[PDB]
Amino acid sequence: KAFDLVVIGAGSGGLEAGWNAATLYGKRVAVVDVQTSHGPPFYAALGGTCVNVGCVPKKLMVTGAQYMDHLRESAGFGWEFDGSSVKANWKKLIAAKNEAVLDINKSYEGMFNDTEGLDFFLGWGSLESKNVVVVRETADPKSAVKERLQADHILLATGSWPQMPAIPGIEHCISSNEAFYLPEPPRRVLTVGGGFISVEFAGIFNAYKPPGGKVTLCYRNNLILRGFDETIREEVTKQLTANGIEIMTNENPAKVSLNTDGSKHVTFESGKTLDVDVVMMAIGRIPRTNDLQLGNVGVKLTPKGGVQVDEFSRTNVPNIYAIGDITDRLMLTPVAINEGAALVDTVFGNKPRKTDHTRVASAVFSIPPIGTCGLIEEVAAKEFEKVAVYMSSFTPLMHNISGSKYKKFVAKIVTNHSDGTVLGVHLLGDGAPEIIQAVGVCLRLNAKISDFYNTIGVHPTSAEELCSMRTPSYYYVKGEKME
Amino acid sequence: KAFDLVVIGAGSGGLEAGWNAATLYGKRVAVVDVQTSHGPPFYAALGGTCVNVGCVPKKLMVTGAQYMDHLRESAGFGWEFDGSSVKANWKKLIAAKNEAVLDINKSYEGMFNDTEGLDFFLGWGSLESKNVVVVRETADPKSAVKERLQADHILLATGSWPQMPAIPGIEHCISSNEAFYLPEPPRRVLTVGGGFISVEFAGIFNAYKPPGGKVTLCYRNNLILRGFDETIREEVTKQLTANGIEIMTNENPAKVSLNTDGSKHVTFESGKTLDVDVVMMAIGRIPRTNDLQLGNVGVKLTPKGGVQVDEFSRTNVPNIYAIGDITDRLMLTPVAINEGAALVDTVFGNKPRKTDHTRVASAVFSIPPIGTCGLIEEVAAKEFEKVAVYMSSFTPLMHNISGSKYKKFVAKIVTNHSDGTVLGVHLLGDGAPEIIQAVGVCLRLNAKISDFYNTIGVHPTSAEELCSMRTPSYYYVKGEKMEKLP
Ligand SMILES: Cc1cc2nc3c(=O)[nH]c(=O)nc-3n(C[C@H](O)[C@H](O)[C@H](O)COP(=O)(O)OP(=O)(O)OC[C@H]3O[C@@H](n4cnc5c(N)ncnc54)[C@H](O)[C@@H]3O)c2cc1C
Numbered sequence: 001k002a003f004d005l006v007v008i009g010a011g012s013g014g015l016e017a018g019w020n021a022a023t024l025y026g027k028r029v030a031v032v033d034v035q036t037s038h039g040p041p042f043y044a045a046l047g048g049t050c051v052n053v054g055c056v057p058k059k060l061m062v063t064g065a066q067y068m069d070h071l072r073e074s075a076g077f078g079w080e081f082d083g084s085s086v087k088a089n090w091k092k093l094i095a096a097k098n099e100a101v102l103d104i105n106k107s108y109e110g111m112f113n114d115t116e117g118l119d120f121f122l123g124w125g126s127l128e129s130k131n132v133v134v135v136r137e138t139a140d141p142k143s144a145v146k147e148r149l150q151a152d153h154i155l156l157a158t159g160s161w162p163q164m165p166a167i168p169g170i171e172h173c174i175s176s177n178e179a180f181y182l183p184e185p186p187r188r189v190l191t192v193g194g195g196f197i198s199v200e201f202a203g204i205f206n207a208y209k210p211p212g213g214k215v216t217l218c219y220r221n222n223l224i225l226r227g228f229d230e231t232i233r234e235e236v237t238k239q240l241t242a243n244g245i246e247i248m249t250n251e252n253p254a255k256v257s258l259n260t261d262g263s264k265h266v267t268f269e270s271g272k273t274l275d276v277d278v279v280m281m282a283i284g285r286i287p288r289t290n291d292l293q294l295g296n297v298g299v300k301l302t303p304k305g306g307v308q309v310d311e312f313s314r315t316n317v318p319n320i321y322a323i324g325d326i327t328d329r330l331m332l333t334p335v336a337i338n339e340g341a342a343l344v345d346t347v348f349g350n351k352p353r354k355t356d357h358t359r360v361a362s363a364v365f366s367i368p369p370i371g372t373c374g375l376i377e378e379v380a381a382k383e384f385e386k387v388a389v390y391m392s393s394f395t396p397l398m399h400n401i402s403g404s405k406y407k408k409f410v411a412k413i414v415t416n417h418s419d420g421t422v423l424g425v426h427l428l429g430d431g432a433p434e435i436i437q438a439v440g441v442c443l444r445l446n447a448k449i450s451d452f453y454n455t456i457g458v459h460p461t462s463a464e465e466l467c468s469m470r471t472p473s474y475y476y477v478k479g480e481k482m483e
Numbered sequence: 484k485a486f487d488l489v490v491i492g493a494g495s496g497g498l499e500a501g502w503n504a505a506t507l508y509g510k511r512v513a514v515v516d517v518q519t520s521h522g523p524p525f526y527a528a529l530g531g532t533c534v535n536v537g538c539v540p541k542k543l544m545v546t547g548a549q550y551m552d553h554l555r556e557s558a559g560f561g562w563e564f565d566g567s568s569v570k571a572n573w574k575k576l577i578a579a580k581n582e583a584v585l586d587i588n589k590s591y592e593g594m595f596n597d598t599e600g601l602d603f604f605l606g607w608g609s610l611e612s613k614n615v616v617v618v619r620e621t622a623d624p625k626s627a628v629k630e631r632l633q634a635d636h637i638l639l640a641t642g643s644w645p646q647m648p649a650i651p652g653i654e655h656c657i658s659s660n661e662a663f664y665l666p667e668p669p670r671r672v673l674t675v676g677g678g679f680i681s682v683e684f685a686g687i688f689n690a691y692k693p694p695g696g697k698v699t700l701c702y703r704n705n706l707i708l709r710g711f712d713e714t715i716r717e718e719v720t721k722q723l724t725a726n727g728i729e730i731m732t733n734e735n736p737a738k739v740s741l742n743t744d745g746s747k748h749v750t751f752e753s754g755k756t757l758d759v760d761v762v763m764m765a766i767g768r769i770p771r772t773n774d775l776q777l778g779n780v781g782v783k784l785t786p787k788g789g790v791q792v793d794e795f796s797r798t799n800v801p802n803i804y805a806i807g808d809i810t811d812r813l814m815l816t817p818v819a820i821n822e823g824a825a826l827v828d829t830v831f832g833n834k835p836r837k838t839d840h841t842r843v844a845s846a847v848f849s850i851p852p853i854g855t856c857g858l859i860e861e862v863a864a865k866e867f868e869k870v871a872v873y874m875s876s877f878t879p880l881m882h883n884i885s886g887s888k889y890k891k892f893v894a895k896i897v898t899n900h901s902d903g904t905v906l907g908v909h910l911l912g913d914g915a916p917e918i919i920q921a922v923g924v925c926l927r928l929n930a931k932i933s934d935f936y937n938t939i940g941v942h943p944t945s946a947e948e949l950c951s952m953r954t955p956s957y958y959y960v961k962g963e964k965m966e967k968l969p
Pocket residue numbers: 008009010011012013014032033034035042044045046047048049050051053054055056058123124125126157158159160176197288291292323324325326330331332333334336942943
């Protein structure tokens with residue numbers, strides 16, 4: 001069959017590209033994915049990683065985990081109930097999550113059924129030739145051919161996949177993929193990694209753990225959440241610890257064996273040991289290029305295995321493009337979506353556009369959460385002669401009364417002190433992911449600190465802290481910090 | 484007895500002006516208030532209305548009230564407990580609120596001690612003359628002088644006070660002042676009015692009512708929350724009703740009598756009756772100008788009764804300024820604070836600056852809450868030839884799981900369709916007040932609809948809806964509503 005565009009991967013970026021090309025530019029579009037609905041064996045499916053085993057279900061589960069705090073915090077506001085009757089029923093959470101995910105799967109199925117010139121093919125997509133995509137039964141390229149798709153244009157949008165370290169007992173560990181399908185909440189769990197997935201799942205498991213349970217997070221480096229504002233890294237470490245999570249920094253698993261009762265015996269490089277029910281590896285995500293047989297067409301990969309692209313998502317092969325996590329840049333759903341829309345506008349609309357990967361607002365659904373947009377001060381200080389940091393950090397009042405006195409809200413604005421231009425805004429505390437969205441719009445408009453502090457506050461909010469900072473807390477001058 | 488600046492009212496505007504004048508410009512500042520800490524008899528105190536009987540305690544109490552929803556909603560996420568054991572201990576809430584407000588009162592006492600020039604005087608400020616404030620023992624002008632303050636500049640910042648309709652049995656009724664100190668949560672309460680205070684308190688009382696409880700909100704006109712986006716007014720009405728609050732619109736109390744059991748018998752203008760334990764009147768706040776004795780220096784008041792001011796907070800009398808609720812405009816703490824900061828940066832910084840009264844972000848801590856900045860479409864439609872309205876309204880997925888299907892999140896962007904300039908943004912749903920703050924910054928920067936839709940979403944959030952709207956839902960062309968442009 002013949003298509004203007006063939007999309008391999010029916011995910012965040014692939015569906016944006018395919019839908020736009022079919023509906024906005026009237027192109028005949030084929031989209032390929034390995035599964036029509038979530039979960040084992042391939043986990044990701046129609047809708048992509050975010051829908052099936054990412055942002056969507058993880059946010060529902062963090063929302064679930066937040067009730068542990070709400071139930072405890074309610075007491076400060078005079079709420080009374082039988083604390084000994086309280087159970088976190090993980091089975092109910094997982095069933096609720098599964099129904100929500102399946103409903104989305106179903107709605108994408110309906111979207112393909114109801115959208116003429118947008119066709120779905122089930123199976124494993126690979127490149128046979130520069131204008132032919134082959135859809136096969138399995139990831140094995142010797143598996144049976146289901147389809148051969150003639151393509152003027154080919155989009156690679158297969159996303160990423162959890163990295164598993166080649167250690168003894170790796171087979172006894174899981175990734176986020178399996179975590180979404182644990183039938184029972186682990187009493188003891190080790191999350192391995194200092195990134196958002198490890199931190200977010202540490203919070204989820206901490207809330208649903210059965211009585212006498214314990215969540216441990218291990219990270220090789222000294223301070224979790226590399227890439228984030230350093231004050232927020234330190235504070236979120238403290239606030240996790242305060243909620244009963246054991247943060248093991250400068251620690252990494254050397255191997256895992258089965259205790260006789262089937263639990264996991266963890267040996268760390270430091271010669272520390274930990275017995276847990278689950279070991280969840282969240283150490284990295286790698287681009288999914290192995291199965292694409294890109295050697296059939298000579299698409300250039302990086303040593304990492306990401307598809308190399310120009311700013312317009314073009315590979316070295318004309319008519320073959322790559323967007324989203326497969327490009328191993330910013331692994332966010334809205335970025336994949338933006339890159340897909342920009343590609344289709346460029347290629348099919350002759351409306352040349354490239355995605356801006358700077359000043360992208362993002363969040364960590366830790367408890368409490370992070371919202372951020374733009375540069376951290378250490379990065380800014382290397383690119384700008386004079387950098388100012390505006391910082392406000394305080395336990396909000398609701399949290400004196402709630403009894404969570406540890407829950408400091410951090411609000412930090414990083415500027416180019418030469419002209420006041422805001423380079424970065426970093427938030428820690430309830431609401432942070434919701435606050436930071438419109439800050440993204442501010443940074444697109446080259447907002448200055450004066451634009452923030454001359455805006456009238458909404459009171460009482462945590463967000464109004466952003467509009468209440470007149471005076472720098474400290475500076476970097478030619479890379480050097482000064483009070 | 485000699486000051487660069489004397490401030491009457493140690494509230495939102497008065498303290499900002501006071502503390503700025505002293506710390507930024509090393510000026511010598513007197514601040515007068517009637518009370519050092521919250522509650523009866525004068526309710527407002529050091530810190531002002533917001534701190535003592537306003538934004539701060541209200542927000543703690545709405546937060547408390549939110550746990551009624553969280554406890555129920557937890558079940559959808561697998562939380563299990565004995566629902567029959569749940570009690571809302573109002574007395575605990577009020578004790579906690581009182582301790583939190585007192586600590587802020589003590590905070591401001593600290594501030595006034597730990598700061599040179601900045602000195603607090605207790606008692607009732609009034610104007611003797613152009614350059615003298617007299618502090619007396621009471622609000623009666625005949626009462627004893629405690630101090631006579633010499634004033635190069637005078638700031639009136641006395642705020643507002645609840646209006647109580649002059650109906651038979653008004654003495655059986657309370658205002659928000661007394662609501663903060665009720666010794667028991669009412670089983671049955673009538674909140675009178677359709678503004679933010681009535682709506683917020685209906686939410687609070689609804690969460691803390693004892694078993695067999697009922698919250699009734701009445702409003703004299705057809706639809707609550709005049710001045711808010713119409714879609715949001717209708718939606719808040721539905722979402723309050725869904726959570727058990729009875730909304731009586733086109734209804735207004737004509738009188739109240741005490742029943743023999745101490746309950747209140749409300750007769751409406753319509754002839755309807757209702758028995759409640761509390762009648763809380765929230766029909767308006769009026770500027771506090773009586774007690775200042777403004778007749779003595781001829782400070783001009785408005786046809787409404789607020790101190791008349793120019794864009795620089797200047798009265799008709801040189802050296803005499805007025806900020807915040809006494810000016811009877813937008814009665815918000817951050818506006819008072821902004822006006823104070825501008826007045827001082829102007830007069831003592833020699834850096835004139837005028838508060839911008841447009842594009843002010845504000846919130847209603849309704850359950851669920853409102854966040855809004857700038858013009859509602861009906862107002863835009865009278866000023867601009869072509870207005871576009873972008874609307875997204877859906878129950879967020881988490882509330883399909885929670886069981887609160889009625890919690891529709893509403894996001895509306897109102898534009899000047901001629902250039903795409905955002906004129907207003909109207910949000911209803913969890914997080915709306917937090918979402919809207921940086922939208923205020925966007926509007927200051929003359930953000931267009933394309934600045935929103937070209938910004939990359941934060942996923943998953945409610946806020947990202949504001950970055951997902953490319954196509955108008957409908958328009959106003961020369962005031963006329965229509966689905967499509969001509
Ligand atoms: C646990 C977790 C949480 C996350 N949380 C967030 C968050 O909150 N917010 C956020 O913005 N981002 C989040 N992300 C990242 C986000 O999921 C990804 O950035 C996004 O899904 C990438 O989109 P994409 O189009 O590159 O690919 P994907 O959405 O991953 O889609 C790729 C698709 O290709 C399919 N596929 C792969 N190989 C083949 C093949 N050969 N043939 C056919 N189909 C194939 C897969 O089945 C998959 O459906 C999260 C990720 C994870 C793992």
